[PDB]
């Protein structure tokens, strides 16, 4: 589809931080973009609103989307427990890339990461499906609440999310 734009309003311990909006490349990975779009609108009656980024590693990425377990073990797609790696056409080209976290081939669920650096070593292992459109400075501010091991000094949540266009 003509590329959807989704927003996340980030909060830190309840205090608002701001909005990051994403362009989803539904023109190259339609199935993967669509799973992330619908979890952002919560239209299948489940999704990202209220979940947290449970692992933030400065200089690398911010990981979230585990709305089931909040720690890396849960989450699910709108297509069921997991779905296949649609394609590896897009690469991890620099800060702002949005890509799917997984537990090996074809295990995509709901977990994702926002790259705060170019992560070329993940190319061909993780499906890139979007990029930050506005609010990269909100993402760089979220990096500061993480650590080498990804534990966060505060609870970073997606207080509200939806589609813009």
């Amino acid at each position: 589809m003509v590329n959807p734009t989704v927003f996340f309003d980030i909060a830190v311990d309840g205090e608002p931080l701001g909005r990051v909006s994403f362009e989803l490349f539904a023109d190259k990975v339609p199935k993967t973009a669509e799973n992330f779009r619908a979890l952002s609108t919560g239209e299948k009656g489940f999704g990202y609103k209220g979940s947290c980024f449970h692992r933030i590693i400065p200089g690398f990425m911010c990981q979230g989307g585990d709305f089931t377990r909040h720690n890396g073990t849960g989450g699910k797609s709108i297509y069921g427990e997991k779905f296949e790696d649609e394609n590896f056409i897009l690469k991890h080209t620099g800060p702002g890339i949005l890509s799917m976290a997984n537990a090996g081939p074809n295990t995509n669920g709901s977990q994702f990461f926002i790259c705060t650096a170019k992560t070329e070593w993940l190319d061909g292992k993780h499906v890139v499906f979007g990029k930050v459109k506005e609010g990269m400075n909100i993402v760089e501010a979220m990096e500061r609440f993480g650590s080498r091991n990804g534990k966060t000094s505060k609870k970073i949540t997606i207080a509200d999310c939806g589609q813009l266009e």
Binding site: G72, T73, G109, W121, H126
Partner: peptide
Amino acid sequence: XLLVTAXLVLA
């Protein structure tokens, strides 16, 4: 190392 997995986090 630097990976993004869901379940067994490696180094």
